[PDB]
Design a binder for this molecule. Structure first.
Ligand SMILES: Nc1ncnc2c1ncn2[C@@H]1O[C@H](COP(=O)(O)OP(=O)(O)OP(=O)(O)OP(=O)(O)OC[C@H]2O[C@@H](n3cnc4c(N)ncnc43)[C@H](O)[C@@H]2O)[C@@H](O)[C@H]1O
Ligand SMILES: Nc1ncnc2c1ncn2[C@@H]1O[C@H](COP(=O)(O)OP(=O)(O)OP(=O)(O)OP(=O)(O)OC[C@H]2O[C@@H](n3cnc4c(N)ncnc43)[C@H](O)[C@@H]2O)[C@@H](O)[C@H]1O
Ligand SMILES: NC(=O)[C@@H](N)CCCC[NH3+]
Ligand SMILES: NC(=O)[C@@H](N)CCCC[NH3+]
Ligand SMILES: [Mg+2]
Ligand SMILES: [Mg+2]
Ligand SMILES: [Mg+2]
Ligand SMILES: [Mg+2]
Ligand SMILES: [Mg+2]
Ligand SMILES: [Mg+2]
Lengths: 484, 484
């Protein structure tokens, strides 16, 4: 097992050093990637290749190897795929051949040679120069799901498919910045360490600054500092960055994740709905070529315009209870009991409406849907709806049964905002340890005047999951948080 | 007094509501920015303007106001600048004119009207519709440095040159990603919360995950996880993200900053030198239009190729001391005493060489200089130079007397690497509380084989300071860390 093959690999390490070669290599110049070779010469016949003597230089990890006396084959793998190499002793010389023979699966090498096809028609490289680049002290794993996440590098090597999800992830984010940049939004960087962790309902990670002897909280949202920039007059700003929440992991939750937050002065949540469907459609179109995608067993149509549905109307359609009716908190609690909806001590009418939605409705929303009108009690930073103040002009985007975005007509009334924070502090006294805390610096900012604004927050990891048909967030994160 | 002004603004808020207006506004559609207006017709005589009746719609903060009677003026400011508005009671009507009259400096408004020039020919908007958008409860500052950092929004409103710095910052980062993307590097996101804080010599911020009951350290570098991706076979990766160091602030230090870390398989530190100068020169050319820049009292030429200077040769040129000669630790300590170079208990020849450089040489490196050959003792993750192993194939980029980048031919030998960490542990016991920790997970990764690689780390904030002629990092960070 270990120390077994391990001792052998250490032994070969010394043998290589004794042959006057650096077992960990120097720089190496390549001319092609494996895939490029196939694209360019894959359809040429054995004869055509012999007549063109195309010389190339490539490098990669040895994945397979078969020795045959004075000559041998091996498949080396680079970031684009595998290419077979053929090494003959009489061609590369005794010294280089000795290096080929001592080479192990896992070792990394560089080669120069001419393109040719074997009798089975496999495009290969007839090696003229064999360069040893790096000795692998451990063998490639036996070719479990957890190892893929615990040791991502092994996943990337053994499951060539896996890298594609991450390449696509980069294209998704680049497409996102392209759209926002071209539409006038300024990409900014605001603090990730806050005096007060606000902007969302979540438990924060607490830390300490030694030199300044100060308690800091990793940000649970980007909202409050971006709003300060709107007060500052920047008008259109966005930030795609890490957010941290001290909470358990799930197929859709990781303690550190990437969120897009953006704010636009002079817009309201209806404008943000349009921006959201356009942005996501733009991304899907550029990256996948279409807005009609497959996710799990669902055919999801991301083609704008998406469905708009008030949360109360959603509960009426999917459950049957009509919360448009003015009722007491006690009446709402009774309904919750009758319909199997779990509620907490601090909850009143608004919280209960939301619980009805989350527990009995949201998982049925497969096609992109803008659920709007969130009760005021759970929307401390959103402006109340003018017609019915029990609700706010806020919406959440639901796709394949989960929330992908959250946005609102931002609350810019400082007096109302202070009141919302006071109500949140009261909720905390009643058991809601996720309630928003007071932020006087933020209220001060609002007092200098924040224009009417439309704000948006998108879970980038979740969007990447949707567009790559990944069932878990652990599949779109290179190094997801692992349990002890 | 200020207290008096607050009461007044508080009462005006009530009078506006009494006028049936939402004092915090609704969405407002605009057609132009203040600067666009001047660009499109800042020279068009009042005649043509009067004939064309060019209707426009803008919005912004009232910075100045003047006039009495049934006609008045005001200068509103948007993200691009200021534009004078002319409001006449006989045009907008009684109710709207009353709103104009009650409007305070600081309040935000939207207007629709036609372009025109006053007697003095000042481009202005002849208002046809006056929309009150937001009441400022606090007065704008009457037209302190640290105060501008504490309330960045006030700075952005009162000082237009500051906002430009941040717009330029975004352009610099955009230009950086374009270059890297176009040169084949894959943009990735790796963990910011680590089991073991490694990749640099620095004190970490410590935190705790409750549900997992796990101690986590905010990353002090991005290196170790990116190296895992190189083992993973990704070949070219980069990440521009936040890094956290539990240390005091300075003219070029903030507890959380942005760093670019990049790794390229099959390249060495010389290749990285070229990449670094080409990248920075590219960004300068794109953003400033030239590689000739000004920083403080210095004229800095960023045109490649930059000077390459070995640390030992730099000390010889500036201090008159030669460290190429083989010498004992005591001989080095003797030289340190003679030249007034402070040293710590855990220091030997290698550390002392670096102390000579940092204490007597670095501040004089104004023009871009690649200082290379750092002693192995202070380079635990860099490969030793083949000809003189007392030094490593590492370089730091110095410009205007400070370090902007750190890079090396990566140490891919797992056996050597473990030994480097062991020597680091020894130093920690000798008083070096910034010594690197023993990362078994990282060592395991190298044991599967990491190809020869060239790595780079650039302080983005410092690069932004350089290209925006900002004397402090506090000038290029929207919200720099404030003291208590
Ligand atoms: N820790 C947990 N473990 C298991 N189940 C849990 C759970 N927390 C909640 N659930 C369950 O998931 C369902 C919905 O819960 P909700 O609490 O209503 O929604 P959420 O998934 O927690 O996102 P959040 O409400 O915080 O979004 P936010 O606007 O702040 O932020 C904006 C966007 O950021 C993204 N986002 C938020 N948190 C994220 C995370 N930790 N990881 C990745 N993305 C995240 C999302 O796209 C979100 O729309 C319910 O069944 C609930 O019980
Ligand atoms: N906190 C402090 N306050 C006052 N004086 C101090 C100080 N720390 C050091 N000094 C003094 O500055 C001079 C040089 O000290 P050094 O310790 O050699 O320089 P450094 O600025 O600390 O860069 P470092 O070595 O940590 O960067 P790294 O490659 O790891 O990482 C790669 C790149 O990241 C950037 N970077 C590193 N730390 C940063 C930070 N905290 N903020 C912004 N950028 C940073 C840089 O561009 C660096 O090249 C000496 O006089 C020293 O005493
Ligand atoms: N929940 C959150 O993280 C919010 N800060 C996302 C943005 C909502 C609209 N302002
Ligand atoms: N000291 C640091 O932060 C290094 N991780 C910067 C990169 C050096 C080259 N690998
Ligand atoms: Mg949550
Ligand atoms: Mg939610
Ligand atoms: Mg949400
Ligand atoms: Mg430092
Ligand atoms: Mg240094
Ligand atoms: Mg440095």
């Amino acid at each position: 097992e270990l120390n077994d093959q391990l001792r052998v690999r250490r032994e070969k390490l010394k043998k290589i050093e004794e042959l006057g070669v650096d077992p960990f290599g120097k720089r190496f110049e390549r001319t092609h990637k494996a895939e490029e070779l196939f694209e360019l010469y894959g359809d040429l016949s054995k004869e055509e290749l012999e007549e063109q003597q195309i010389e190339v230089a490539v490098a990669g990890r040895i994945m397979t190897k078969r020795g045959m006396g004075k000559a041998g084959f091996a498949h080396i793998q680079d970031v684009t795929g595998q290419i077979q190499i053929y090494v003959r002793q009489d061609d590369v010389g005794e010294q280089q051949y000795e290096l080929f023979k001592i080479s192990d699966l896992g070792d990394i090498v560089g080669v120069r040679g001419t393109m040719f096809k074997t009798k089975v028609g496999e495009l290969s490289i007839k090696v003229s120069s064999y360069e040893f680049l790096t000795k692998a002290l451990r063998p490639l794993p036996e070719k479990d799901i957890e190892q893929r996440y615990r040791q991502r590098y092994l996943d990337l090597i053994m499951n060539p498919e896996s890298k594609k999800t991450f390449i696509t992830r980069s294209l998704i984010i680049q497409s996102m910045r392209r759209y926002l940049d071209s539409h006038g939004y300024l990409e900014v960087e605001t603090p990730m360490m806050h005096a007060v962790a606000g902007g969302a309902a979540a438990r924060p990670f607490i830390t300490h600054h030694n030199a300044l002897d100060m308690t800091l909280y990793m940000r649970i949202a980007i909202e409050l500092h971006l709003k300060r920039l709107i007060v500052g007059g920047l008008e259109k700003v966005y930030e795609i960055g890490r957010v941290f929440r001290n909470e358990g992991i799930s197929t859709r939750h990781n303690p550190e994740f990437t969120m897009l937050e953006l704010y636009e002065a002079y817009a309201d949540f209806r404008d943000i709905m349009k921006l959201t469907e356009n942005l996501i459609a733009h991304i899907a179109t550029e990256v996948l070529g279409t807005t009609k995608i497959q996710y799990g067993e669902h055919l999801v149509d991301l083609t704008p315009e998406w469905r708009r549905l008030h949360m109360v109307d959603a509960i009426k359609e999917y459950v049957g209870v009509d919360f448009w009716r003015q009722m007491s908190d006690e009446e709402a609690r009774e309904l919750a009991k009758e319909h199997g909806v779990e509620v907490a001590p601090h909850m009143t009418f608004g919280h209960i409406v939301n619980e009805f939605f989350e527990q009995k409705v949201e998982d049925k929303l497969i096609q992109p849907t803008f659920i709007y009108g969130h009760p005021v009690e759970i929307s401390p930073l959103a402006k109340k709806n003018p017609d019915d103040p029990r609700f706010t002009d806020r919406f959440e985007l639901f796709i394949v049964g989960r929330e992908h975005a959250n946005a609102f007509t931002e609350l810019n009334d400082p007096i109302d905002q202070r009141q919302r924070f006071e109500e949140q502090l009261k909720e905390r006294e009643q058991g809601n340890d996720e309630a928003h805390e007071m932020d006087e610096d933020f209220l001060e900012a609002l007092e200098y005047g924040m224009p009417p604004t439309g704000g948006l927050g998108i879970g980038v990891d979740r969007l990447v999951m949707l567009l790559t048909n990944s069932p878990s967030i652990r599949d779109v994160l290179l190094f997801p948080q692992m349990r002890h």
